[PDB]
Design a protein around this motif. Structure first.
Motif, short mmCIF file in Angstrom:
data_model
loop_
_atom_site.label_atom_id
_atom_site.label_comp_id
_atom_site.label_asym_id
_atom_site.label_seq_id
_atom_site.Cartn_x
_atom_site.Cartn_y
_atom_site.Cartn_z
N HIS A 1 0.82 -1.20 0.00
CA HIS A 1 0.00 0.00 0.00
C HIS A 1 0.86 1.25 0.00
CE1 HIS A 1 0.53 -0.42 4.50
NE2 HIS A 1 0.55 -1.68 4.11
N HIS B 1 4.98 0.28 1.09
CA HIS B 1 5.25 -0.85 1.98
C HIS B 1 4.83 -2.19 1.38
CE1 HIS B 1 5.00 1.95 5.78
NE2 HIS B 1 6.06 2.19 5.03
N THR C 1 2.52 0.50 11.46
CA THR C 1 2.26 1.90 11.65
C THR C 1 0.81 2.36 11.73
OG1 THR C 1 2.74 2.58 9.42
CG2 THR C 1 4.39 2.13 10.78
N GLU D 1 6.60 8.09 6.00
CA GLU D 1 6.74 7.82 7.41
C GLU D 1 8.13 7.86 8.04
OE1 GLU D 1 4.18 4.16 7.64
OE2 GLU D 1 2.96 5.60 8.49
N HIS E 1 1.62 5.48 1.76
CA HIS E 1 1.37 6.46 2.80
C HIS E 1 1.83 7.71 2.09
CE1 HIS E 1 1.04 3.54 6.15
NE2 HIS E 1 1.97 2.86 5.50
ZN LIG Z 1 2.38 0.88 5.83
#
Ligand SMILES: [Zn+2]
Length: 257
Positions: free
Chosen positions: A91, A116, A195, A103, A93
């Motif tokens: 996915h 990720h 996360t 992140e 972020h």
């Molecule tokens: Zn992630």
């Protein structure tokens, strides 16, 4: 029942998920002057199968591509891992402009998105049972840096049209996400967590030094997705990154000099 906003933000997650507040949380700041080379780190490899892909969802926090992991199909191995591991999902972020969105940070420096790739150890029988091991998950981490369009990444973007909204699912086959990888496989490794809630402390992180380049307009297509179902009031998914948590005494190693 969590979020990136201001009454559900990450600030609060532990009010309902209390791993959220353990001693091994991700993500972290990476301070390259506190990090040493470890000459016993080997390289990693993938064998992936583009035919493993199944679906693409928008779960209201993020866009997911799911894969088939019912057996040993698309495999990650070597590195620090003990064993071979199964691909399950990827996915992303991002934030609300290009100057930020990742992140992890590297020496202060933020990227525009983080990708990720999630794997799990077959030794532990079951994705769900590996959430209880310290090394049950393996994530490959990739940074997104603005630039030239990426074509293999477009393939994925085009499909977002069909899940725009939270809830939505759609089929998504024949995509090998190794196509996204950059040229180097130099890596940082540490132990931490997921996360997003419930923030299980299950993760062997492999962060790649080298960013995959993408276009601003590619980035704003990710930024379009929304976090309200159809029948409900619009709202964009504009950020979905978590801020850096405490290293405590955790050792970050590099693959590379
Ligand atoms: Zn992630």
């Amino acid at each position: 029942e969590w979020g990136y906003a201001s009454h559900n933000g990450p600030d609060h997650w532990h009010e309902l998920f209390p791993n959220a507040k353990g001693e091994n949380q991700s993500p972290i700041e990476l301070h390259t002057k506190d990090i040493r080379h470890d000459p016993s780190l080997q390289p990693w490899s993938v064998s992936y199968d583009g035919g493993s892909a199944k679906t693409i969802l928008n779960n209201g926090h993020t866009c997911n591509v799911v894969f088939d992991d019912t057996y040993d199909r698309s495999m990650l191995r070597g590195g620090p891992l003990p064993g071979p591991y199964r691909l399950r999902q990827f996915h992303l972020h991002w934030g609300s402009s290009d100057d930020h969105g990742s992140e992890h940070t590297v020496d202060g420096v933020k990227y525009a998105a983080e990708l990720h790739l999630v794997h799990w150890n077959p030794k532990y029988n079951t994705f769900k049972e590996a959430l209880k091991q310290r090394d049950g998950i393996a994530v490959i981490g990739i940074f997104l840096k603005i630039g030239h369009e990426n074509g293999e990444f477009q393939i994925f973007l085009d499909a977002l049209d069909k899940i725009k909204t939270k809830g939505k699912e759609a089929p998504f086959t024949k995509f090998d996400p190794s196509s996204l990888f950059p040229a180097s496989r130099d890596y940082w490794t540490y132990q931490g967590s997921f996360t997003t809630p419930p923030c299980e402390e299950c993760i062997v992180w492999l962060l790649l030094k080298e960013p995959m380049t993408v276009s601003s307009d590619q980035m704003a297509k990710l930024r379009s997705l929304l976090s309200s179902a159809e029948n409900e009031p619009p709202v964009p998914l504009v950020s979905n990154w978590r801020p850096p948590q405490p290293i405590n005494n955790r050792v970050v190693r590099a693959s590379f000099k």
